[PDB]
């Protein structure tokens with residue numbers, strides 16, 4: 019085994035990201051992990067000659083796990099992991115009956131990382147009250163979280179999987195970051211038995227290994243823009259319905275509001291439902307049920323996801339590349355943050371399974387509230403890109 | 419002594435070569451001073467004589483006070499050298515410090531000149547002492563240690579110092595040592611006998627590693643003046659805050675006052691700085707005299723009272739839990755106190771921030787709770803238990819109904835007036851027997867002429883004219899009109915997503931006067947329902963207002 023040489027771009031410089039303050043339990047949880055890793059030769063204490071920094075966090079049943087935020091590095095590595103060694107995405111995966119996800123991160127700890135690239139993997143375990151200098155380390159092996167690790171490993175991964183794949187040609191296996199996506203049309207017990215067989219292939223070589231047990235991507239359906247059913251329609255009830263439909267007409271080709279606009283009245287007054295409006299309404303209903311005409315996935319373009327707080331433990335979301343032209347819409351159903359972090363994880367997983375990439379999330383929360391809390395509930399090995407937005411009150415209403 | 423410690427490898431910036439700066443002809447006094455200076459350094463192995471085999475040069479200088487100081491201009495080399503890791507990520511807060519029986523402050527002698535520079539890098543630190551009138555080849559030299567004024571000296575020094583302490587640290591986990599530049603602060607629960615002995619074990623550990631300290635019996639008596647604080651054994655405080663008695667205040671005087679008050683705010687409760695800040699607003703020369711308002715004179719009076727008596731703070735006991743209390747002290751103004759045992763404050767704080775243009779006490783308090791939450795994780799590594807001037811029901815009613823997601827940790831209501839409340843609540847469904855006001859407010863982009871107005875389900879119609887108003891301003895004055903002319907129960911229809919958004923958000927304070935006027939109206943009303951329709955879509959009521967509203971100018 020030798021090292022695959024890595025390069026950012028001749029102009030692109032490494033990451034220099036601040037470490038978010040960490041709680042006592044997390045710093046202590048990290049010192050344990052980082053010491054064992056240093057002893058095992060996975061990492062190495064570093065000096066000031068390394069001006070680079072990637073944040074570290076600790077996650078969770080009872081065992082603590084080191085999560086490293088490779089967002090900036092992955093952005094700066096891109097050419098290496100997308101073009102130079104890009105893993106292809108199977109269109110089949112999203113069609114499979116059941117999809118099991120397995121953590122294959124332990125495999126990267128066996129492959130050495132290009133000696134010339136290691137400086138960019140620098141991270142810091144901070145000190146409480148800044149009394150001690152703060153422990154610096156860098157990777158020697160392939161790090162978990164960095165998109166370059168699965169790119170390098172793919173060659174060794176294809177070897178491992180070769181028998182299983184030959185033996186089960188109707189099983190689909192995708193590799194996204196530290197995880198394996200395994201899909202089959204098999205009955206549940208049989209799917210589970212195939213996963214177990216798979217674990218063992220990985221066990222030789224060396225691989226121990228908001229969502230249920232597995233994902234069911236064929237059962238995944240778009241939450242339509244719903245038009246309420248009523249026998250009593252007020253002036254306000256129609257006004258809402260007109261505004262909702264008008265907004266949908268910007269996305270859905272075929273939506274008409276004319277017949278409804280055909281009715282200075284008091285909001286509270288009860289206007290009776292016309293023949294042409296009752297038709298238009300029922301017609302629009304059948305349009306919003308079926309997917310959007312004209313919107314397609316452009317691989318070159320970035321995915322964008324919006325989430326709305328619907329209250330009572332309900333959340334709504336929409337995946338698009340070009341604003342409001344929806345690729346997928348859905349829903350998610352104890353505290354606002356735990357719920358959002360849950361919703362985020364679910365949307366990102368669906369996104370991975372469907373397009374082979376994570377969306378940039380538009381978070382209906384204050385920047386600081388999120389950064390402080392997300393880690394307490396975060397459970398994934400990847401971290402999506404996120405921006406903090408103010409949900410326009412209108413969009414919440416339109417998506418129920 | 420030059421520490422035996424291994425050298426930190428240094429490189430230049432990629433695609434760059436070393437400095438080749440010409441040494442300016444220096445004065446005879448300066449030449450005589452520099453040679454004398456360099457000779458004593460050469461004998462100590464800090465520098466080494468070189469030939470014209472080396473092609474790099476940096477200008478040297480000299481300054482006087484009878485002592486002569488050697489000034490090296492690393493400006494170019496620093497531009498050419500690689501960036502390093504940030505020396506320290508923060509500074510300790512006295513509130514986070516633990517109680518210790520005894521202290522010793524050791525200061526490291528000739529720090530940068532006591533640490534070796536990477537052999538492969540030395541060539542670039544080359545400097546030349548010119549000959550008199552520069553007629554003959556000067557005396558070429560290069561550093562073997564960290565040069566003074568060079569980019570990586572703080573990084574490389576602190577890095578070394580840390581590695582040198584690491585063994586001693588592991589060997590003495592019950593001893594706290596704080597590193598800051600060429601200073602070392604040692605604390606222990608050991609008695610003056612065992613402590614003084616451990617001090618010498620350290621001084622010697624530093625010596626085995628080429629680092630000299632001062633000497634014994636230099637040690638002082640409490641308080642220990644550290645980083646702008648007074649460090650007593652059981653307490654801490656900010657160093658004497660002198661609030662100047664001045665007749666006339668200049669921009670510079672006010673600026674410094676705000677800095678002193680903000681610094682005092684760490685342990686002195688109820689310190690206010692709003693009114694004094696309002697003064698600094700605008701251009702104004704540093705020396706320009708600024709007449710104090712009644713509000714600023716009142717604020718300074720209150721500040722003088724708080725600072726009339728010395729207030730102290732306690733150290734952190736990691737066995738106990740943190741408790742943070744917040745108090746409202748005017749619009750935008752919030753004051754907090756963190757303690758573990760009732761009113762034995764570890765630290766104090768103020769918070770005044772306007773995230774966006776418009777906000778309410780609930781959003782304001784939540785925002786403060788966050789600022790304190792982060793502050794706590796930084797200082798103590800754990801979140802506090804909160805005591806808030808808001809009813810649990812007031813919170814519940816707000817955060818469930820709001821579209822933004824929030825979560826605040828363990829908190830309890832404490833009855834500390836003024837209490838945080840929602841000054842009004844918009845209706846959920848349209849009101850019956852309450853006049854429906856369809857509003858609109860079109861403005862011309864060129865003539866700047868506004869035309870805010872309304873039409874009602876009761877045939878009332880008013881169309882006012884505005885001067886130099888945006889389409890935003892008019893869409894908002896239309897709502898203020900509907901609010902003014904209406905009864906106690908009102909329905910208001912708008913085509914402005916902007917206006918609705920502002921209003922939906924339930925603000926109780928705003929940057930715009932129009933909004934403050936609208937808020938005042940909202941507070942007064944018994945019931946207010948606010949609906950939205952898409953403009954130009956021909957809505958029965960909306961279309962009707964647009965006719966008389968858009969009539970002339972756009």
Ligand SMILES: Cc1cc(C#N)cc(C)c1Oc1ccnc(NC2CCN(c3ccc(S(N)(=O)=O)cc3)CC2)n1
Pocket residue numbers: 149510514515516517518519520521594595596603604605638639640641642643644649650651733
């Ligand atoms: C950040 C920092 C700064 C300084 C300083 N100066 C010292 C250390 C250890 C230092 O670094 C730390 C680190 C952890 N805890 C403390 N607690 C200090 C609080 C004040 N205390 C003290 C004890 C006796 C007396 S006395 N004997 O004068 O009454 C005066 C003060 C010494 C320990 N300091």
Ligand SMILES: [Mn+2]
Pocket residue numbers: 857858859893896911912913914
């Ligand atoms: Mn309007």
Ligand SMILES: [Mn+2]
Pocket residue numbers: 858859860893913953
């Ligand atoms: Mn308008």
